[PDB]
Design a protein around this ligand. Structure first.
Ligand SMILES: C=CCN(Cc1ccccc1C(=O)NCC1CCCCC1)Cc1ccc2c(c1C(=O)O)OC[C@H](CCC(=O)O)O2
Ligand SMILES: C=CCN(Cc1ccccc1C(=O)NCC1CCCCC1)Cc1ccc2c(c1C(=O)O)OC[C@H](CCC(=O)O)O2
Ligand SMILES: [Cl-]
Ligand SMILES: [Cl-]
Lengths: 149, 149
């Protein structure tokens, strides 16, 4: 589970916010894209996997699961591409809660930037630093460091 | 030590590659931008600081040191903005070597993508995973986890 991530796509201001969640910690990376295509998703995974040791990704929908470009990125980066079926029903709830929380934070910062992408990065920062007492940023590093050792 | 990063700007294909190096580990993040501006640099630092506990940034040149947009990003993200003067001359050489290494890797992957940005992210992945033994990705996590504990 140190290497397990979940993709999540949410919408705001007629744009798409693509999110990757490190399941065990709740740490996130996110980007704003015009629409959720295989190429956009592939490029996002490529970025993520260069930055964190991504072993497995649960894709956010069937189109990204099927996409040969997404499969190509997962092959390139050594990621096991999996479905995102919530066999554990609590999974849906957690993601939905996170999207609601992220949108709330974006609202709280929205006037501190012209562009949504800037607001989204502020929200990523606030989310990852929030103490809940460790932060998600602390938890991910601790989990991965323990795995290396 | 755990919180110190250095900015670095290099050029390829008439574009600019902006790099942040975690000094203690050699771990990097990078992006392709059309030109180095204060806004581009500010946005890059905002992304970086949401993802890693960035305490101090040594800026890459005087224009980014001076930039009020860069200063605003550093204020927002709680980063101490510093100059990048190589008081230790070995610092110049290290960054020079890294740029040469990155450009080499980009050449090795260049035909595996149409767009330079894709090649640069492949290069980030290869750089961070390269065992020299531990990888830079392993070193950064271990350094930061040790700090937290
Ligand atoms: C003079 C800068 C323009 N903005 C002024 C602004 C406009 C409206 C409200 C507040 C502020 C404001 O000063 N906020 C304080 C502070 C500055 C930003 C970091 C922390 C918050 C801010 C900004 C900076 C970099 C960006 C932005 C944006 C944006 O407004 O969204 O948008 C995406 C762009 C992408 C990279 C590229 O394309 O160069 O990088
Ligand atoms: C059908 C995809 C188009 N490319 C085909 C290609 C073209 C030439 C050579 C090899 C390949 C090839 O299949 N390489 C294998 C493989 C592809 C997945 C990544 C690992 C390597 C690849 C690609 C994917 C996403 C991107 C790209 C690019 C690009 O070619 O650079 O460019 C930036 C763009 C930004 C996000 C956005 O704008 O959607 O995301
Ligand atoms: Cl963090
Ligand atoms: Cl890594």
């Amino acid at each position: 589970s140190p290497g397990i991530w979940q993709l999540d796509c949410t919408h705001l201001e007629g744009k798409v916010i693509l999110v990757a969640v490190h399941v065990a910690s709740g740490y996130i990376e996110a980007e704003v894209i015009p629409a959720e295509t295989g190429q956009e998703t592939a490029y996002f995974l490529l970025k993520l996997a260069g930055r964190w040791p991504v072993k497995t990704v649960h894709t956010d929908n069937g189109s990204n699961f099927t996409s040969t470009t997404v499969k190509a990125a997962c092959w390139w980066a050594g990621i096991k591409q999996e479905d995102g079926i919530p066999y554990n029903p609590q999974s849906q709830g957690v993601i939905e809660s996170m999207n609601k929380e992220l949108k709330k934070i974006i609202g709280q910062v929205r006037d501190q930037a012209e562009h949504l992408k800037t607001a989204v990065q502020m929200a990523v920062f606030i989310h990852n630093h929030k103490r809940k007492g460790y932060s998600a940023g602390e938890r991910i590093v601790d989990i991965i460091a323990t795995d290396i050792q």
